[PDB]
Structures are given as structure tokens and as C-alpha cells.
Design an enzyme around this catalytic site. Structure first.
Site, mmCIF file in Angstrom:
data_model
loop_
_atom_site.group_PDB
_atom_site.id
_atom_site.type_symbol
_atom_site.label_atom_id
_atom_site.label_comp_id
_atom_site.label_asym_id
_atom_site.label_seq_id
_atom_site.Cartn_x
_atom_site.Cartn_y
_atom_site.Cartn_z
ATOM 1 N N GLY A 18 0.761 -1.246 0.000
ATOM 2 C CA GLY A 18 0.000 0.000 0.000
ATOM 3 C C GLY A 18 0.788 1.291 0.000
ATOM 4 O O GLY A 18 1.144 1.793 -1.065
ATOM 5 N N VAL A 19 0.984 1.886 1.183
ATOM 6 C CA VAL A 19 1.676 3.175 1.318
ATOM 7 C C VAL A 19 2.899 3.026 2.257
ATOM 8 O O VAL A 19 2.791 2.514 3.382
ATOM 9 C CB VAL A 19 0.723 4.354 1.670
ATOM 10 C CG1 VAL A 19 -0.186 4.040 2.854
ATOM 11 C CG2 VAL A 19 1.484 5.651 1.887
ATOM 12 N N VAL A 20 4.069 3.436 1.726
ATOM 13 C CA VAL A 20 5.407 3.283 2.288
ATOM 14 C C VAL A 20 6.162 4.606 2.105
ATOM 15 O O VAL A 20 5.702 5.471 1.366
ATOM 16 C CB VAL A 20 6.059 2.101 1.490
ATOM 17 C CG1 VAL A 20 7.559 1.982 1.704
ATOM 18 C CG2 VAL A 20 5.376 0.774 1.799
ATOM 19 N N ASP A 133 -1.725 -15.656 -3.328
ATOM 20 C CA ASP A 133 -2.280 -14.362 -3.744
ATOM 21 C C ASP A 133 -1.400 -13.648 -4.752
ATOM 22 O O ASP A 133 -1.257 -12.422 -4.685
ATOM 23 C CB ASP A 133 -2.552 -13.454 -2.527
ATOM 24 C CG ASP A 133 -3.440 -12.249 -2.795
ATOM 25 O OD1 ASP A 133 -4.229 -12.292 -3.780
ATOM 26 O OD2 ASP A 133 -3.351 -11.260 -2.020
#
Ligand SMILES: Cc1cc(Nc2nc(N)nn2C(=O)NC(C)C)ccc1Cl
Length: 344
Positions: A18-20, A133
Site C-alpha cells: 500500500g503506502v510506504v 495471492d
């Protein structure tokens, strides 16, 4: 706070996590990614997942699998430690962004990206880890074209706890568009063969630069797979857990499989040969990642001496345990400590 050892540049997007934050080791100038897992111990399922990922990424040492470069140590007292900071390789893009863009993607791009995926998988699978996944967004790509498998939250071994909901609700495991028929249909055959269906889906998506089975819901997803693969065999039909799905598949007129040459007109012959070995209803009918690396389509890159297996296997026992949030926190803190006690 980021241990005063790092310098934060900017907040970037990541296909796997996601967000890093893009950052740099202040001593060396080495560019890194810093993942913050806020309030990491607040919810059981999130806490279990952070532990799973940390144990998996610590067990692996492979160029095609995302590595933990560092984990920040608690700076505050134990009771105040709520957020985990993980230092990863800086991966500027992912296969989703590359496929679905105005960027080049020739048969040679496809061949090299599939090669790196299968190389990382042969290694993962020999450790008895199933990603469960795989999708283009989860296949991180850097400036030097290095593909690294990320996002092991859905990962499990050959044995799973009946205490978790997905043990019975296999159709909710992972992403619809890349979800293996054994998960969609609860066929009671859950091996590394799950990943090879997902690889087949990613392979097709690279060849056409479009999703192969973009089903709008459960039934529509099955309809899409059956439009190409044809009707499943009576043995696959008998193995279907739910009576409504089984009745629904039996209610359909017979359909013969569509040749891959019709699906992807004029696509490379060896590419389509390999694709057909991956996209099979029967998990055991599918090619393994190791045998796929031996296929003539990857002959260009294939070097058996440069494609290692993983020893010892990975053990998912820690994950089958009914642990409280506090016990998981304790196990995560012990992973941080171990990670540091294994360096120095
Ligand atoms: C790289 C690494 C990442 C994690 N990420 C992680 N844990 C939990 N619970 N969520 N999560 C996410 O990345 N969530 C986003 C998809 C929104 C955990 C450990 C490690 Cl090593």
C-alpha cells in the site's frame, strides 16, 4: 521516529504493501523503503499477519523475493511500542503498473518477467510455502528490472488450522481474477499448484496486456474460466463442495476448451505451450514452477545451477496457535530481537 539512522524522502505507493516511505541510510546513502505498520498489535488478525510476514521474509534469502533490510528496534518502553517499522528494498513500480501503461512490453519483457517469477517460486515452493495471492500488483519491479514477489499475508503451508474461516471458505482466499479453481470450488487439493494457476493468469495478462478472467462476481468468474477451459470433468464436478455450485455447473450445456491460439491470436507458440500447462482445472495436471523453468520458452535465462531451492522448509505451526494480541506482540518483538541477534 525512524531510529535517526534514516532520512525520509517521500511517501510513495507500493503494489504489495500500500503506502510506504522512500528513505536513505544516513551513513551510506543507500536508498530504502520504510513500511510503518501502525497500531500493529490492536487487532488479532492484523497482528497474526505481521508475525507471519516477518517470519516468512526472514526465512527467505532470494533475489526474487522481497527482503527485510532492517526492522527498527523499540525506542520507547515495551508497553508504549505500538508501531512496527520495516526497512525493505526500494521498488519503484510493479507488474500491474508496467502491463497497464504506455511502457514497452515485448515478448522478451514477458519471457524475462515470467522467468524471475518462476525462479522465486521454485525456491518458495520447495520451502512448502504457497503464496496464494499472486497478481501483477504483488510482483514488485525496480529500476533495474528486478522482479521481487511481495505480500505474504495470504501465504500458508500444506497444512492449515481449522480455527480460521478461510479453511472452509476457500472461495474468499485471495483475489477473484487470479483465484485457482480449487479455492473457487473447494476441491480439497490445496498445494503450490494454486500459485501456478495465478502465474498462468499473470502470463496471459502480460501477453495481451489485459486480464484473462475479469469476473464481476463468483458465478461470472466461473463462467469466464469455463468459456476458455470448457466444462470441468465429472471428477472435478463430483469434488465440488457446495451443492448449488455443483448443480449450477451440471445445469450448463457441455463446452469444449478453446485453443490458446484462438484466445491470443498470433502469440508465440512456446509461450502458449507453457501457458496451457499452467491453466488446468485439475491442480495435479498443472506444471510445477521447477518444471516450468525447464520449458523451452525460458531456455534463454534457465540455468539450473543459478535457480536454488530453499532448505530447511518453512513451518507454519506458530500461526496455527490461538494467540492473544499481547502474545502476538511478544512474538513480533522476539522476531525484531532475533533479526538483530543474527546480524551482530
Ligand atoms: C514488509 C512487511 C509488511 C507487512 N504489512 C502488513 N501487516 C499488516 N497487518 N498489514 N500490512 C500491510 O502491508 N497492509 C497494507 C496492504 C495496507 C508486515 C510485515 C512486513 Cl515484514
Amino acid at each position: 521516529d525512524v531510529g535517526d539512522e534514516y532520512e525520509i524522502i517521500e511517501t510513495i505507493g507500493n503494489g504489495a504493501y500500500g503506502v510506504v516511505s522512500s528513505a536513505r541510510r544516513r551513513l551510506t546513502g543507500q536508498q530504502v523503503a520504510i513500511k510503518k505498520i501502525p497500531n500493529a498489535f490492536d487487532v488479532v488478525t492484523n497482528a497474526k499477519r505481521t508475525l507471519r510476514e516477518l517470519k516468512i521474509l526472514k526465512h527467505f534469502k532470494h533475489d526474487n523475493i522481497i527482503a527485510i533490510k532492517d526492522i527498527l528496534r523499540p525506542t520507547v518502553p515495551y508497553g508504549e511500542f505500538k508501531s512496527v517499522y520495516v526497512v525493505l528494498d526500494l521498488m519503484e513500480s510493479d507488474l500491474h503498473q508496467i502491463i497497464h501503461s504506455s511502457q514497452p512490453l515485448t515478448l522478451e519483457h514477458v519471457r524475462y518477467f515470467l522467468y524471475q517469477l518462476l525462479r522465486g517460486l521454485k525456491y518458495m515452493h520447495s520451502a512448502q510455502v504457497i503464496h496464494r495471492d499472486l497478481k501483477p500488483s504483488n510482483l514488485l519491479v525496480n529500476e533495474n528490472c528486478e522482479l521481487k514477489i511481495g505480500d505474504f499475508g495470504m501465504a500458508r503451508g500444506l497444512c492449515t488450522s481449522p480455527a480460521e474461516h478461510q479453511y472452509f471458505m476457500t472461495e474468499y482466499v485471495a483475489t477473484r481474477w487470479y483465484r485457482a479453481p480449487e479455492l473457487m470450488l473447494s476441491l480439497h487439493e490445496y498445494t503450490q499448484a494454486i500459485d501456478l494457476w495465478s502465474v498462468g493468469c499473470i502470463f496471459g495478462e502480460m501477453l495481451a496486456r489485459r486480464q484473462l478472467f475479469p469476473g464481476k462476481n463468483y458465478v461470472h468468474q466461473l463462467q469466464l474460466i469455463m468459456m476458455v477451459l470448457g466444462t470441468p470433468s465429472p471428477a472435478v464436478i463430483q469434488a465440488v463442495g457446495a451443492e448449488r455450485v455443483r448443480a449450477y455447473i451440471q445445469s450448463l450445456p457441455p463446452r469444449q476448451p478453446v485453443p490458446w491460439e484462438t484466445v491470443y491470436p498470433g502469440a508465440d507458440r512456446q509461450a502458449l505451450s507453457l501457458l496451457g500447462r499452467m491453466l488446468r482445472f485439475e491442480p495435479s495436471a498443472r506444471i510445477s514452477a521447477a518444471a516450468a523453468l525447464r520449458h523451452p520458452f525460458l531456455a534463454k535465462y534457465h540455468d539450473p545451477d543459478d535457480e536454488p531451492d530453499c532448505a530447511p522448509p518453512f513451518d507454519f505451526a506458530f500461526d496455527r496457535e490461538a494467540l492473544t494480541r499481547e502474545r502476538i506482540k511478544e512474538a513480533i518483538v522476539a522476531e525484531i530481537e532475533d533479526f538483530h541477534a543474527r546480524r551482530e
